[model samples]
Target chain A: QESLKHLLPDLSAYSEITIHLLHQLVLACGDVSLVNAVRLSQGAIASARDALKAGCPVVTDVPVVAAALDQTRLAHLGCTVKTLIDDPAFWHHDHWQQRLQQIPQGSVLAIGYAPSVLLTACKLIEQQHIQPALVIGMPIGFSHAPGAKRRLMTSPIPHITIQGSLGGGLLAAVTLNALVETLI
Target chain B: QESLKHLLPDLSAYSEITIHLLHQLVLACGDVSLVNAVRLSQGAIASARDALKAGCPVVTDVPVVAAALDQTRLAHLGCTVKTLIDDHHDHWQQRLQQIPQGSVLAIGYAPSVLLTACKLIEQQHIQPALVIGMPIGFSHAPGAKRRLMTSPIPHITIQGSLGGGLLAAVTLNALVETLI
Candidate 1:
C-alpha cells in the first residue's frame, strides 16, 4: 500500500497556472489520477491576475462559497468580496437576480453553488449584459451543472470551470483563492 | 466520451451505512474510485445513529463546519451544535479536552486541532461517542487522521488529505437522515 510509484499521472505538460491551481484542487479533494474535468479558457489565469491587480470586485454564488475565500489576500490586493446571497438558505433569496445586476464590469466572478445562478451568468454574458474579467463557474448539481459548464466552455468570457457535476463551494472557492495566491 | 463501462468500482462489499455515507461523500467532492482512504472504527455508524437518536450535543472543530451542518434536521432531533474554535484562539485547545465525554465530534478544519482531539483520545482523557474527523490540510491532516484510525474510539474519517467542513457535516447529516 506504500506505492507512490506511478500512482499519479505526470502533470508536467500543464502550464504553471494550471499546475498551481490543480495542485490546490488535488490537495482539496485528494485525487490526482484524473484532471480532465478541468476547463480553462485561453489566458484565464492571466486575465484573472490582471483584473485582480486592477482591483476588480469579487463576487461568489452564495455566502458559503463567499466564506471559503481568502479574504485577507483579496483585501490586500484592494479587491472587495461580496456574494449574491446573504445567507446559506439556498434559493430562498428572491431578488438574487437583482443583486446580480449590480455587479460592475471587469469583476471577478467566483461562483460555486447553484447551477441556476451560473446559467443566469451565462445568459447575462450572451446578452452582453455583463462583461466580467474572469468567471470561475463551477456549480454542483447533477442535472443542470454539467450543461451550465458546457455553455460556459463556449462563452466569450475568460473562465475556469470543472466541466461536469464535479463542482462545489470548496473547489469553487479554492479556484479563486489559488488564483489570488498567484497574484500575491 | 459517453462511456459508462465500469468507470466506477463495484460497491457490493461495503456495508449499507458505509455505502450511504460514501455516496454523500462522493457527491460532496465528486470522486469515487478512492474509497479505500476512508477509515471506520467498529460500529461507528451505529453509535452515531444512536447518539443522534438520543439527542446528544454535536460539536465541531470550527464554525465553517458547523455552518454546513443541517441545522433544521439537527434541531428537529433536539440536538444542538457548538464549535470548539469559535474565534481561532489557541487556548481553545485547552477546552477541546473539556467537552463532556460521549459528545459527538464532527471535526472538519485545522489538522492541529484534530491532533489535539486525538491526543485526548489516545491518553484516554476524552471519550466522544463518535468522531467525524476529516480535517483538510497538507501537513497535519493525514497524520492526525491516521492516529485517529489507530485509536479505540469510534470514528468515521478519510485516511488521506481529503476532507472539509462540508464533508464532515455531510457525514453527520447523512447519518441523521437515516435515523428519524
Candidate 2:
C-alpha cells in the first residue's frame, strides 16, 4: 500500500475516504490520470454502497469484468455478479432489451467492454425501463466510449465514469471493487 | 452479413481456407490489420481441425473465452472446452499442466498463462498440437507472442498488443466453423 502512496500525487482536495477510493482506482489502472478523469455524481458512492449492502445484484457487460470482480467479497453481502455477453440470445438485438428487463430494479449496473451496452443502458434509463442504484460506465472503444459516457452524465441517474475513451473491463471492475472495499 | 462484405477489403491474397478463417476473424474484430497480423503455421488450421475431429480437448485461459466459444459447433466435433481462471485452488502454472496432451490450447486472457504454457513447452513437459496465444496486455502480451512465434511448436498468434479473449475465441471458433 505504501508503493501506491508514492505513485499518487496530492489528495488534499479530496476527503480521506475519497482519497482511499481514488487510491484503489489508481491501483487498478496504474494511472494517476484517472483521478482527474473520474466524475462522480452526488451520492453516487453512498447509493452504490447502500445497494450493495442491501444485496442487490451487480450486472456486468462482459464476462471478463464479471470474472475480475471481487465475487467473494460481494457474496459476503449476498450479491452476485452477472453478465449477459455469454448468453446465446445476447447476439440478437431484441434480446438485449429483454435481457435488460431481467436485471432487478435498483441493482448496480457495471459496463466495461462494449459501448453498445452503455448506450443500451442509457436508452433504458431514458425510457424509464429500469432504475439502477448506480451505473459504472467505463467501456473501451474508439467510437462510442466517450459518447456513451456523455449520455450517461446527461441522464438523471447516479453514475461514476472515466470521462474519456480510456477504460476496459479491468478499469470498470476495479472501480466497483474499490467501492465495495470502501463500503466494507 | 452482406454489410460485412462492404466493410472488409478483398481477401483474395489468402488461400480459400485461410480467407474463410480471416473473414470470420475480421468479422469479430472489425479490423483489417488482423488479416495481416495473424501468424499461422503452414498447416495450423488443418491440424486444429484434425485435433477437433479426434475429440481433442480445448483449453482456454479464461471463462470469457470459453463462454464466447460456440459450444454447439464444438459439441458437433465432440470437443470439450475447459478453463482455469475459475479454479481458485490452483495457480495458473499448475493449471498449465492440466491441459491435456495434444489439446488445442486457446489462450485469450492472461499473459502469465501464455508465458507458463511457453515455459512448459520449452521444458518438454507438454506437447499441445496447436497453441492459440493471444493474451491482451501491454506487460507480457507482446513478449509472449514473440516467443510463441519463434517456438518450434505449430501456433496461431496475433502480433503486437491487439489481442483479447474475444479475438482468440473468434479465431478458434472460425477455424472450427471452417472445418464444418
Candidate 3:
C-alpha cells in the first residue's frame, strides 16, 4: 500500500517464490500495478505445492484454461486436470451442488471464467460440501467479480485471488503454471 | 446497445456481424463499456471474413493466441496458423517482417507488436487483410494503437492500454463462428 509514497513497494515482506509469482502476474497483463490487486491467503502456495507433489487432481472453470496449462508437466506430476465446461451438465443452475459434488477431495480448483460458479464453489467450501487443497478464483467483470474475490478472501480455505475487476482464463492458468514451475 | 443505455453505446451503424463480435468482446472482460473504447475500421470484419473464407494464413503475436483458436475449424478452412513466438529468429521484429500480405494478423501482446505491420502498411510494402491489434501495456501500446487507427489497413483495436490475447482471439474466433 505504501507504493503511493514509494516508487516501488518493499517486496522484502514476501518470500522469494511469492515475489516470483507476483512478477509473473504483472508480466501476464503487462501492468506493474497488478501486484496490488493480488492477494494470497495463508498456506495458499504451500497447499498447492503439496497437492501437486502428491498427484492431486486439478480442475478449471473452462476448457480454454485447461488447454493453457502446461499439461505435459502436470501429467509428469500425476495430476489429472479436468475442465468443467466439457461436461454437458455443467450449464445447470445447481452446477456447483450437482457438478462440483463429484470433484475429488484435496484437488486444486481454478475458477477463471464464470463468477456464478466461483461464488457457489466458495459457498460449498464454507459448508464443507467440497474440500479443495487450494482455490484460485479469478473471474473478470464490472459486477459479480469484485464480490466473488472478496468472498474468497473471507473464506478460511487456502486461496489465490485478484481483488478487483480484472482476470481471465489465461491469467489463472499462468498463476497455476508458476506454482508448477516452482515445484519443478 | 438496445439492451442497456448505461452499459452499451448506439451500435446501429455497425454491421450485424460487427455487433455480434462487439458483444463477444464485452464477454471477454465482462465490461460493457469496452464497446465505447473499441475502434473497428470500416471494412475490418468483411476483410477478415473474406480472408478466412479464402484460406488465408493466420498469425498471432503470441502462441497462446494461436492455441486459443479453434484449430479444427481453422484446419477445415485450410488456413495455416502460426505464432511469431514459435519462430526462433533474432526476435519478433525480424520474424514479423516475413508475414504474408493478405494474411490475418491477430496481435495481442508486446507493445511494439504492430510496429512492423504498421510500418509496412505506411510504406506500401505489405497489406494484411485484417489486423486485430490488441497489445497490452501502458508505455508503448497506446502509441502503437494510435498508428493502427491512423493507418488505412483494416483493423480492430481497443483504445488505451487495455487488451489481451483472448480478446484478439475472440475477435478472430467470432468471425470464424459466423462462417461456420
User: Global lDDT of each model?
Assistant: 0.76, 0.74, 0.77
Highest DockQ against the true fold, candidate = 3
TM-score of chain B of each: 0.89, 0.90, 0.89
DockQ class, candidate 1: incorrect
DockQ, each predicted model: 0.15, 0.05, 0.20
The fnat of each candidate, in order, is 0.19, 0.00, 0.14
lDDT of 3 by residue, B39-108 (tens): 8898888898999999999999877678667777889998999887763446876767788988999887
What TM-score does the predicted chain A of each candidate obtain versus native chain A?
0.90, 0.90, 0.89
Candidates in descending lDDT order: 3, 1, 2
Highest TM-score scorer: 3
- Candidate 3 interface RMSD after superposing interface residues: 7.0
* Residue ranges of candidate 1 with Cα displaced over 4 Å: A1-7, A88-94, B1-151, B159-180
- Lowest lDDT sum, 10 consecutive residues, model 1 chain A, at A1-10
lDDT tens string, model 2, A1-184?
1144554578797766667777655544234566788888888878899999999999988776786577878999999777867741347665655777778988999887677888889998998988999998887644656788899999888998877545666667767887887776
TM-score list, all predictions: 0.61, 0.55, 0.80
* lDDT, residue B167, candidate 3: 74
Instruction: Give the per-residue lDDT digits (tens) of candidate 1, residues B1-180.
Output: 211123345777888777777765664565553367677888798888888888888998877678667788899998888888776444778778787777899887667777888888888899889998877543566787878888788998876434454577778877987876
lDDT of 2 at B140: 66
